[PDB]
Design a protein around this ligand. Sequence first.
Ligand SMILES: [Mg+2]
Ligand code: NA
Ligand code: NA
Length: 188
Amino acid sequence: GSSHHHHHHSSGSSEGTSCNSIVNGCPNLDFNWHMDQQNIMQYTLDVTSVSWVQDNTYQITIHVKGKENIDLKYLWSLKIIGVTGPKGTVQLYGYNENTYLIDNPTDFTATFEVYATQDVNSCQVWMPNFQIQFEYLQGSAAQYASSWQWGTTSFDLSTGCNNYDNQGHSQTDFPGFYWNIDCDNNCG
Ligand SMILES: [Mg+2]
Ligand code: NA
Ligand code: NA
């Protein structure tokens, strides 16, 4: 059968609709300032794919990269929180939760669903913002504290274009993003 479209589970299966243009909504804000002020190592986030499922639900993939490589042994837990979607929390790593879905907390991807409803214009909607909660050097990972050299060990990194100071420093750590409604690439 066809594999042009990514298939999704359906209330059954359905054809995903891939969005062609995934736009950083605020690439001229300074995001680094907000991590630097908290002594958090800089990270970046990109949205690398968006597929419309149905309704206003999209399956998105993110890619998160730290400035320096931090070995997995330092990590205790990693989760996406505050998600506007089917699941409000997406566990990525945690011994307590038997979850091992990444192998490098400084270079990882994650795929999850969001409800994207706030219009940019008549064709495009914003990603709803979320946070990524990192806990290093807790539990069993505390034993590696003597070689830790990357600053603050437990922190949340947030997305968005809607929170910045009067000098263009973001109060978020990562940009917000937008894409076409229903991933209809012919809108407009
Ligand atoms: Mg698709
Ligand atoms: Na629909
Ligand atoms: Na956003």
